[PDB]
């Protein structure tokens, strides 16, 4: 049974609730993202509206079969009616085709569901700036002041100089980056880039980033693995076992991989700065753990909030203890005290 935080209030609207069968009285679903725990439920027989982003669109129908008849594909930053109510999608700054949804409820409500977001300050110039929100279903993923991590430019800039060194200073090293989901493609496409050469990685991987929309992207990716010397592998394998067998497959063409696990916060942020990252290391393998997050960090969330001065706040992350729960409140009392509404 479908969660009273995945429906909106005074619509037949659900937002990310696909694993519930039909729910009663649901009109249109909607998808925030193409990220498995939010699309959990989906396939070729779903025989409901979906209502999601072009490229989340594009990921629906050739990753999970969904017939193109039940798709419905909006333009973000444009007034939309759907079912008789007024939305708008936002992008999210989260992985490629994310979005918010802005709900214009018949009583004269605003709701602001985030989906998945990582705030940013140009987002206090989007269709927000224009009106008041009542109600914010937020992504509190990181609502806690222990979890902060660099800015995506920071951590991109250290993997390119970490990546270029190394191949210049051995033009048999290989470099090999971890992926499970779309999201955080700048990483493996920015080393590509520096090294004057395309991303190697499977057929099923190339499949889905042939689904986002990434200007001149038949320039940047292939799945001929011996013309490449940056390759995907699935997040699993980045380890010094599977790193060693995949050496093993390239024929003699390398020497030595660096690899890179993109994760987001770990316990180690509370201690080193970005510039002072190491790896770990065994022979000829080296491994970096870098905190690229598309999720908002503590300062970044408070922020956002303490800006859009909602009536009311939803979470939608970390609800299942009474513990988390209990700090969240905390926090979003401190901030309406400290700022004044
Ligand atoms: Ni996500």
Redesign the pocket.
């Given at each position: 049974t479908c969660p009273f935080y995945k429906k909106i209030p005074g619509t037949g609207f659900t937002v990310d609730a696909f694993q519930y069968g039909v729910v009663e009285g649901c009109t249109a679903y909607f998808l925030?993202?193409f990220?498995s725990?939010?699309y959990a439920g989906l396939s070729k027989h779903f025989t409901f509206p979906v209502y999601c982003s072009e490229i989340t669109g594009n990921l629906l129908k050739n990753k999970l079969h969904v017939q193109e008849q039940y798709i419905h594909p909006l333009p973000l930053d444009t007034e939309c009616i759907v079912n008789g109510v007024k939305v708008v999608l936002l992008d999210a700054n989260?992985?490629p085709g994310?979005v918010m949804i802005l709900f214009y409820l018949p009583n004269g409500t605003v709701i602001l569901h985030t989906?998945?977001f990582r705030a940013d300050p140009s987002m206090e110039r989007s269709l927000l700036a224009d009106q008041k929100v009542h109600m914010l279903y937020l992504?509190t993923t990181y609502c806690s002041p222990e979890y902060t991590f660099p800015s995506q430019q920071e951590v991109i800039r250290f993997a390119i100089n970490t990546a270029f060194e190394a191949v210049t200073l051995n033009p048999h090293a290989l470099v090999v980056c971890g992926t499970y989901?779309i999201?955080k493609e700048k990483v493996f496409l920015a080393i590509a880039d520096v090294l004057g050469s395309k991303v190697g990685m499977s057929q099923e991987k190339y499949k889905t980033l042939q689904c986002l929309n990434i200007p001149e992207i038949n320039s940047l990716i292939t799945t001929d693995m011996c013309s490449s010397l940056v390759h995907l592998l699935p997040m699993m394998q980045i380890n010094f076992k599977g790193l060693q067998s995949h050496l093993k497959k390239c024929g003699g063409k390398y020497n030595q991989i660096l690899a890179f696990r993109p994760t987001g916060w770990t316990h180690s942020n509370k201690f080193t700065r970005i510039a002072d990252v190491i790896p770990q290391t065994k022979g000829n393998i080296s491994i970096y753990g870098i905190p690229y997050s598309?999720?908002s960090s503590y300062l970044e969330m408070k922020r956002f909030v303490q800006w859009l001065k909602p009536q009311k706040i939803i979470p939608t992350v970390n609800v299942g203890t009474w513990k988390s729960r209990s700090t969240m409140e905390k926090y979003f009392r401190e901030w309406k005290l400290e700022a004044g509404y």
């Open positions: 925030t993202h990220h725990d939010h989260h992985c994310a989906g998945d992504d989901s999201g598309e999720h």
